[PDB]
Amino acid sequence: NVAGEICTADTLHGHALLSYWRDDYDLNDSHYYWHMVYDRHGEVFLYVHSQMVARYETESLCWSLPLVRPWNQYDDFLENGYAPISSLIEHYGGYPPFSTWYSIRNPDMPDTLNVTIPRARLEEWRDNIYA
Amino acid sequence: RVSSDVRGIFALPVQKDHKPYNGLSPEHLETMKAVSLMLDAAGPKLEDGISKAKELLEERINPELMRDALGIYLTHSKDAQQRKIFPPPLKNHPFFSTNVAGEICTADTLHGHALLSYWRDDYDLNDSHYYWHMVYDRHGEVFLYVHSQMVARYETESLCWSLPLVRPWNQYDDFLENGYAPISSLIEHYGGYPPFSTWYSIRNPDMPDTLNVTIPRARLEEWRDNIYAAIRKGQFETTSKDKPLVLTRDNCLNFVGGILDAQYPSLNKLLGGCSLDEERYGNLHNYGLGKFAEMAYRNGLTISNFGAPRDPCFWRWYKHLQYYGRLAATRYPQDITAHRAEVVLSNLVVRLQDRSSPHYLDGHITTFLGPPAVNFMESKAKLGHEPYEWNVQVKSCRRSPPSKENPQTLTLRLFIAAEDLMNDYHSWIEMDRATVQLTDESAITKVRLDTDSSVARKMGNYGEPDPRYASAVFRHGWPQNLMLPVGKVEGMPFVAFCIATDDGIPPAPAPPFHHYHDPRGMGYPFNRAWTQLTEDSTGKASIRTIISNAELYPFITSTTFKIYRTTKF
Amino acid sequence: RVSSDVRGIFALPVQKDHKPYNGLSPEHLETMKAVSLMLDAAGPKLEDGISKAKELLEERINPELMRDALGIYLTHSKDAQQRKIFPPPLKNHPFFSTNVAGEICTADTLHGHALLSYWRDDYDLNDSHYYWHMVYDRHGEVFLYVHSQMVARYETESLCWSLPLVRPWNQYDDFLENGYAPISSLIEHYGGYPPFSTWYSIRNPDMPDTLNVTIPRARLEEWRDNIYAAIRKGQFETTSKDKPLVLTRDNCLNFVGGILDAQYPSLNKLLGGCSLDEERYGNLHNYGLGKFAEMAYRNGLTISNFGAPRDPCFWRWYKHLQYYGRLAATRYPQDITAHRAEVVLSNLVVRLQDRSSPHYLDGHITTFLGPPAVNFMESKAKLGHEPYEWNVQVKSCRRSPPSKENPQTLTLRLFIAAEDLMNDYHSWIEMDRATVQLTDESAITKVRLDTDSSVARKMGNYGEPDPRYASAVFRHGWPQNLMLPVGKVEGMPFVAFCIATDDGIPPAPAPPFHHYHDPRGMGYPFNRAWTQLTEDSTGKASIRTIISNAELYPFITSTTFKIYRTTKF
Ligand SMILES: [Zn+2]
Ligand SMILES: [Zn+2]
Ligand SMILES: [Zn+2]
């Protein structure tokens, strides 16, 4: 059975409508191959990603969805949640409404998969690059 | 050999030499039915009929015609039944073939009732109804009840997402202001129509005279107004000036319904040789469906009656059909106490089967919306529900207490309604009909599972069969997954209703007509108005007050539960 | 002295000794009308009638009764008219008094058509209609046309915000699924009803027998079904078995309309001494309104017919009234060319008056939504529009060219429709009726201002008077600010329609009945079906194709414009 997507008034909240854009196959193949490629290596990383942000914000405005709130505060909530298309949910899943970063560590996630980088460490780098 | 030949025939594709066929056109249907009969006349065994089929198919008759005709043949065939050969699943129809296109979920395509698409496109609903019209005394009454009943469910499902109530197709110059576009895997075979499409007043100019008999709008409107004005007078005029057919509280719905479906042969058998005036009352249902197909035609080609339930407009049409039910129901009320069972009902409960989820509670059940099977032509979701059960306590009332030697035998009738739509007879949705036999003076607790419902089609999702019900199946039952209205995330309030009736004494006809047999009228007690309410003088009376009065009407109990919506990715 | 005494009487508040009055109850109305007449019989001058008023008011008759009765008196009084004394503005009614409560704009209170509140609460619409029923051969025809016409506008306004089309009150067991709650300054005097309220089947238990004659539901339903079945047969049964009243294409609407409003005296004057069977056709409109008021009653007290247009349900009722228009209109078509004017229409334009805003364009006009005057009981907004004008070119066709000595005199009829609702006769909104007189063989460009419309009430916002129109006023005209449908921010497409008719030769009755006088039928040409379309044989014909054919029907021109929405804080 080929599972489709769930279009329901319960699953279209937030930016869920921009899913056609974010799930688009050619965007995903493009970007998939992109990180296989990658003097100007910083400049390209930053430009490419800033540029597909500008497009995503514009696409957001086109359906009159709210402008995207940057992840500038690291204690912020992901208030919408995310659930992959039903054909991918098998391999990996998403997260529920209002998920956050783990402050220190995900307890249930092995030390083999993840080096403990608590939140305050990232925040330090951020504040250090800012300054 | 035989079931293979069948799947072969059903798989045949229409080609460009084939005489065009319009499976929604009454005339084309009359032709189709004649080809059905044509097969039956080729012998008493299937091989005989199936030969006649290959025979005709080689002579280049239309493959879509043969499917409706071989379907009807297979369904009523003693040989076929006993050999348990059936018309294939709807999946085997050609339109279930051609990248897999999904559906378009866009803020531009969710206006109107487009959200109820998961319900209207649902595969098991479509197979159910597809087989239903292959099956079809009470032929009018069943047509009218079945379709009124899936209207009530669709309106309730509408209310669950807080969509507007459906506006009946009562004015024939009305617009279809939303439009309709089939799921992208079907758009190929047939398409839809744009926003604000109407019926053609006279005719679709671009639609051949071969596909469509010109039935202008004003003709249908005449039939409508003629049936309206009969129901009120109380009689249907006969071919003979002074011998009308008088509507009785018992016949009324079977005649209104049947005449709506132009089953004059059947009805005529009860007039003592008179005939109903077919020029006066016409064939409103089938031609009316004919006008919708006409409206969506674009330039002949072949049209099937495939995926009627999908089209949002057929539900506006079935709502108009229901209007005739509403008219007749309050003209001929019934006594609610007339067939009471000498018994007392208490403690009506709708529960989850799995009570080991505390905090759990009685009267809090649960539906879920999971992914649509796109390869089964579904869109948006695939409804389901965690397994439910209902029970009620039944204790006797009889002067002569029930004993192993002399059982009290009664029937329990389970209906539900959205608390909002509660005081309308026609919104109550039938959920079970169960026979209880008492042998003590003591109370019992009768338990009915969801999967045992007398209303439910006995299969799993996508026509997968129930071992427990190898015999019955009820392929044209109400799907299990759609048994529960979807509800709301907050827990939507519903009301449950049980009545106990003395039906005795009865004999269900032979297949495939065993299923809707009911001594009381199908949908009792909600099929006609209650003489308690029509003849009320206080003003205080309502369905609500009556089915809460456990003192005055103890063979009726009601209780309130909540249905909870849920998504399952 | 006199106008002061009038404002005095209209200001009188109902107290607790006053006999309860139900301004929506037919019986109470018959009583009220008798008190009206009672005043007129007190003399030919106003002082005479006004004395009778103080007289009765001291004898403790109901102040709300006196207002409806003094209003009708003042409106039809030769003395009053000539002394230009009128019933006061609606503002002077007591309910326009008691912190100023505003309206509640909350995501919980904007469901359904609650957004169209600015339109239904609009002060000038309410004063217009308030005075209208004080005014009211063609009495049925006007009732039916006026109310059908403000339905068409309300449905269009509905479409402008993309709200669902209004579901007619055609089934009397229907729910009012949205509820209604008056603006907070009115909630005191009267209140509304909750979601899913219905008519009481028999009676409101808590509503005194003094306020309400028990008219159960099934009785109204009988009238309905009886009028339905007349319109189809073509006749209205008379008190005398073999002399029915036969509907003609000319009488049909005045009789259907009048009978709907139980104006049997008036109609009976045209039957040559026969009477219409009042037991058969009843008083459906007024009792039907009576049932809505009944539904909203809560525990007698006094009810006024104040703010009918406000209640969302009266617009569902007027939609049902329109159904009778739709039924009769297609039964009795008319020839569209029957009264053509020997003339050729070209270049129909709807423009802004102020063309010095380039980039400006022909056919792009503009409405705005500003603040509601809360002290005038308005909610949500106060619609308005930048000043518009229309023009068309008119050039003659006559064998004998028009000369100063022998003018060609024709009439131009301006209608608009939402492009979506274009192919429905009954959605076209009348915008102007203008007389043109030609004296040359040459073309002219006829210009009509918005403020000169034959449809428009000649006042500024809130009943402020027009110097230019001291005489005419048309207090019960369609408000100027609501002349233009609101439109969409994107520019909503509309279609404009002009027809030229030869009306000659005619004599408008005396006030206050001069205004709806039209030799052709009010609303012509859209008041009946077109025999061009009913008798079409191709299928290709539509209102669209006809009013685009400038070759075949040159006395008809159409053009497309766009209305643009706007907010003005
Ligand atoms: Zn990247
Ligand atoms: Zn069906
Ligand atoms: Zn009115």
Residue numbers in the entry:
A (entry chain A): 146 to 183, 198 to 290
B (entry chain A), C (entry chain A): 42 to 139, 146 to 183, 198 to 360, 369 to 575, 577 to 639
Publication excerpt:
Our experimental results clearly indicate that the hemocyanin-like protein AsqI is the cyclopenase, which is the enzyme in the viridicatin biosynthetic pathway that has eluded isolation for nearly four decades. In this reaction, the active-site zinc ion acts as a Lewis acid catalyst to activate the substrate epoxide and facilitate essentially an anti-Baldwin-type epoxide-opening 6-endo-tet cyclization. Subsequently, the conversion of a 6,7-bicyclic skeleton into a 6,6-bicyclic quinolone framework occurs upon elimination of 7 and the following keto–enol tautomerization results in the formation of the product.
Based on the structure and the sequence homology of AsqI to hemocyanin, residues His176, His180, and His208 were identified to form the metal-binding site A in AsqI. However, the second tri-histidine metal-binding site B found in hemocyanins was formed by His346, Leu350, and Y387 in AsqI and no metal ion was observed there. However, re-introduction of different metal ions (Fe2+, Fe3+, Co2+, Mn2+, Ni2+, Cu2+, and Zn2+) led to a varying degree of recovery of the activity, with zinc ion achieving the most outstanding recovery. Supplementing the reaction mixture with 30 µM ZnCl2 doubled kcat to 16.0 ± 0.30 min–1 but had a little effect on Km, which was 0.066 ± 0.0052 mM, indicating the important catalytic role the metal ion plays. To account for the role of zinc and the enzyme in the reaction of 5, we also optimized the structure of 5 in complex with Zn2+ and two imidazole molecules, which model the two histidine side chain groups identified experimentally as the metal ligands. The structure shows that the metal ion is coordinated to the imidazole molecules and the epoxide and C2 amide oxygen atoms of the substrate in a tetrahedral arrangement as frequently observed in zinc-complexed protein structures.
